[model samples]
Target: PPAQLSVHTVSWNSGHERAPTNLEELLGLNSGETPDVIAVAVQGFGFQTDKPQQGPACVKNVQSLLTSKGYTKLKNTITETMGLTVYCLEKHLDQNTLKNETIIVTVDDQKKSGGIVTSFTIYNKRFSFTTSRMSDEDVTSTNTKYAYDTRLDYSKKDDPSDFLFWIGDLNVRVETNATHAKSLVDQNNIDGLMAFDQLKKAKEQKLFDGWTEPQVTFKPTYKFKPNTDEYDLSATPSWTDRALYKSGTGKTIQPLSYNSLTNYKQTEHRPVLAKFRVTL
Candidate 1:
């Protein structure tokens, strides 16, 4: 019989907002069921270079929340605007070989784009979790955008993994007029809205090749008024934050749910959580 592993992943732009007071919902601990793994990716807008100073505290908060329940930090990486943390059950650390690396690409000569890939093997099956970000600016150029993809693709090819996941504030947006986009949202037309997702266009262009996002039934998770569900019309309502999954070595990965955490509406962009199970 194959072993089943549950995974919980969340992505948030934060817009400079720190971690929330309670992580019960953010880490999916509210169910009284601890997932086999928990990974968080955060993109910090307007972040400074001197190291977010507040970053350690932010990571500490999450660490404390999970450590109490027997989870151990496998690895964590933090940059000026992006953060990624991976945790596995303490029992897994005794035998599994864990490794992680970060790839940073500078756009406009600014170090705001990159990703972290963390992999661990158990029962001889390797699994990878990645969190990445690309600055909203200077990505319009296909040449530069392709460069970002080049840096990201290295992780995709090396021996691969039985299961792989990538999530973050991808900086992708919906290409539609405000009124039309609003109308689509008002009617809850997920299919209609997803038709214009820029990430789809990126895939068509061969940037995010072979990466697949499960069906998105939730509304756009970006450009909202701070602390409210209201969409700020200043910018198009886009699916800026997203989650995607892939598989290698003939294993199966299944999505149980994908959604935006409406309760954590402290920033213009709400946090997105994805829950899935992998057969090893």
Candidate 2:
């Protein structure tokens, strides 16, 4: 069979984050407007039962569809594991959202439709972030503590992996001065991404910063600018939002966007995106 050349990443986001039509028009990282989207689930473990189930509940309501081939391929995936939460995988290939070689699946919950994308960090080769509590350590479900950091496996691509490809926001700001705390990163053997310029040493080694490769989104993502000046977070543009990729397509991708010029054109950081293709 032909390869499933799909472009896959964590598009689990919403409006002002809708992939833009092109890179130049993306306004260096401006976010685009998202549309009416319905949220769904893939079932998981819970905090109720002592001997919790290991699969999706019989009364469970899953609302996602895929190509016939997808169904047939994932048939054997209907089993339970951790906590009776069913271990199933559903490809978001229903809407044109699913692409060939280059797929775009996000982790957004901003729509409030009973959803909230919890972004995580994967530095030092292993999953970044730490915890002190076993029950509450590396907290999950809290949204912040348990995030689904976006990533791209470009090793499957042809490029030599020049730039960094870290996606999404941490919601947790790591300061430049506090960059010294990065020692904790090395101490943790973190590896995914760390910046090249300022705050390098404090930064962990091989830490995948998540939003580096495609290098769409830059710094000042949160309110963390260069100085401690009191700047309006809701003020004018910034380059924070991202879609870090393996390489630049040079060809502008349409329909996909980061943002648009709405009445409230005053975000401190501008969201950015990258045009790409997958040959796998």
Candidate 3:
């Protein structure tokens, strides 16, 4: 017999903005079903030394919210500008075999525009979660350099994880011009707009080759005017903050829901959430 594990994942590029007062909707708690696991990834996460309290305070807020919901923090990995946190139901700690914690830092430069990979195992199933960002200034050169970093290759690990999830502000944009991209958006032609997505091109280049993203029904999640329902249009609206998954052990990883939380408007990018049920 196999057990089913419901997992929720969120990715947001807060642009150094503050955390929301309530994380219920952000964590999918509004859906009335609590997931067994939750993973949160954020870019532009922490603040400077002058306001050192801001980052830790934000993390504490999230920690308090999930703790009240009976979830225990499994790992919290942070860099200067990025953060990845994982939580699981408190009861699972006693019921499952949880072990093998690993944190891999992909980049340590000034821009801090690389990624973080955090992994662990529970119930004898390994799961890897990555939050990565590529420099938007020179997408081509930066992608060529950082996107292929061996540290980002999860499959090459000696003991590969049974499941791998990659989420963050990947900086992958729509290749079409802003005007044309907006036109397609206005017409609700997401497929047409996604035809020119840089991520697809990157896949063709063999980067993130085996990863799978749920079918996107929502519009682009990036380049919005902060606190507005409007697109900035300075850059082409694209699905920059994304969630992708892979199953290394050939087990079933079903995506029950995937969407962007439009209510969160504090930054230029909206948060994206994906709900999945993994059979183990």
Candidate 4:
């Protein structure tokens, strides 16, 4: 039999805001999808301050639900302000052995430009889940980068992750005038809006190298008034919360869907979720 695994990933920046009441929609379990792996990356004051316990009920509920479903927490890395948690249903696999490791890299002068990479292996395949919070500076150029240091530390090892899902409040924003950003969003022009994405520029410069983000058809998941569809034009409407994938080995990693969950209304930025089916 061919090896197959279903993975669901989400990233959100709550600005230290509390949790959502329910995580069903955010976790993709609302659609009756029992993902083999559920990886969550959060960047906010609560997670960043190492106070996820103060987050919303949904955060705790997600743990309870995954536990009830017999999912094992493979690894978790929480900094003063960011978090990455990976859960796997390894009981159903041929091998349940899970080995994990973590690395933290400082990418900027303020020590604010750092990220955590949590790598693990299951079913004899290496998988890595990363969550990072870049410097909040208004940097729009490839020359001015925060994640450059992240790549240096992550790529140090000769062996790479067989499957990687990097998710978080990447701090990559739309580099456009407020009015133009609003116009594109008003017209539902995702492509036009993405043209100003700083992450794309970074990737083009090989800063992110092999990482690949899914084709985003949904609207930008940022700069919203809490609990509303209204876009706050003070900042460019951008895909700040993102999930990117990469394969160290040539394995089929198919993205099933990528979208922002609006039901999580506790923060100015909505949670973004991605689903993938991978052949082991």
Candidate 5:
């Protein structure tokens, strides 16, 4: 029988906010269906350099929750302000054949702006997960480089992974003014608002080529007033947190659901979740 794996990926910019007591809703376990693999990427995590234990404490909190559900943490990578964690259900992994690798690329000297790549093989199928953050100036620069861009190319030509996912607080914004963007959101015209999405412009600039995001049906996941649904207006509301996927092989990667977790209002940006089923 061909193996099918369900994967749940989450991207959030916590803004150094307090960690939630429970992650069931954020991880999509609230639906009672456990995914085979879960990848969590966070930007602007607890940046208290003085409190060196904060990062580990937060990861441990998530570890405790997932461990109780029969999951094992395969990789946990953290920089100054960013973190990427990958967990897999123990039953589906072959310890003998599992080849895991992680790469940390920091665009800035402070290590606050950059990306993390986690790649591993399970059941003879290769999977890669990447999470990155870049400054607004870099994201809009014509000569700017992205950590995931080279990886994407290698995945196509070199040692290709069956499934590749890029998720993070990408910092791409809506190009239109706040008033117009809000009016479109008010009318529930997501397609119209997407016309000016920076991700679309990035694609036009030959960035993130071949990566595909599921059709966005929800409101922008960013630039909201903290703890409220109101737009901040300081920046145009946009889908800053996102999930993008690509298949290096010809395998089928079907998106089951993609939406923002609105219940988390501690930060100005809501978290985004995407669920996929991959046939191998």
Candidate 6:
């Protein structure tokens, strides 16, 4: 398995995540030894900036390694999450190179250990952005169809940085913004995602709702109480997570983590992942 992929379904539990250092120590990201096959760079590339001082060093080193790849290579963005910084890198990646890539994401709870996220590499894929993480029954239905997608597209073409977040949720719902209305909520959960269509129609975009659809593939991570067992295992999960790609199709639309004790025992979020690589 020299160039094969190893899937590590991840999640945001225990307040935040902490990726290990070095390949051997890499708790969630280890496809084994090699030169560059392991894809050292991932989303949420930051370390513990909110923690003591040592955690910041982990974030710095991780960022340095990801940004210093090559001339064509670039450092997309540093998502300072709970206790980590996620990195997005690419070069036409797909069993060849991982360039012309963008990692579109959102960072929340920066006040808490710098918000953390773990991720894998991908390219030319249609991804969706949505989140079902809700605590208030009086919560706003932040449909993923178009509200967030429209905002995300603004950042895609304008910025030539290393990462490009296609669509993301503040996990607070769109809150009836001036851009898109509230009644537009995708009634079936699937329809709400079609709003990316607006972006696609405007720029001949190519993104797709690959992550949210394909139901029963994953479960929900958000709930009213932690470890309280109050969420509905079947309909509880909302598409708050992201869908990813490398190139050939920038933010045309769309994009979790997994970890639990019982069917719906304990967890926060799940990562929907893909396998990608490079020849160079």
Per-model C-alpha lDDT, please? 0.76, 0.26, 0.79, 0.77, 0.83, 0.31
For candidate 1, the per-residue lDDT at 176 reads 91
lDDT computed for candidate 3: 0.79
Any runs in candidate 3 off by more than 4 Å, and if so which?
48-52, 94-97, 137-148
Best by TM-score: 5
TM-score, per-candidate, Cα-based: 0.90, 0.29, 0.91, 0.89, 0.93, 0.37
lDDT of 1 by residue, 70-180 (tens): 888877777777777888887666453554444454444566666666677665667777766765545534543422354455336867778888888776789899889
What are the per-residue Cα lDDT tens digits for candidate 3 across 136-181? Answer: 4534433463244457658667867788888887667788899999
Listed per candidate, the RMSD to the true structure in angstroms reads 2.5, 14.6, 2.5, 2.9, 2.2, 10.9
Candidate 4 structure quality by residue, lDDT tens digits, 57-102? 6557777878888788777766666777888885754444556777
- Worst lDDT run of 10 residues, candidate 6, spans 126-135
lDDT of 6 at 25: 25
Q: Which digits, one per residue and each the tens of the lDDT, describe model 2 over residues 164-268?
A: 233333232333333343343335322222332222321233223322344222233333232333234342222233343333333222223233122222233
Question: Of the pair 1 and 5, which is ahead by lDDT?
Answer: 5
Clashing pairs for predicted structure model 4, backbone only: 16-45, 19-56, 47-81, 48-80, 48-81, 48-82, 49-80, 49-81
Q: Write the per-residue lDDT of candidate 5 for residues 1-280, one digit (tens) a residue.
A: 2379999999898866766877899999997988999999888844546264666667778888899999999998877778789999988788787888898876656666778889888889989999887775554234553334453333565767899999997767788999999999999999999999877677777778778999999999888888899889888889988999988888889999999998998889999999999998
Error of 6 at 238 (Å): 2.8
**Where is model 3 poorest over a 10-residue stretch in terms of lDDT?**
138-147
Order of the predicted models by lDDT, top scorer first: 5, 3, 4, 1, 6, 2
lDDT of 6 by residue, 61-106 (tens): 6556544642122232333432222333234245443332333333
Q: What local lDDT does model 6 show for residue 247?
A: 32
lDDT of 2 at 36: 16
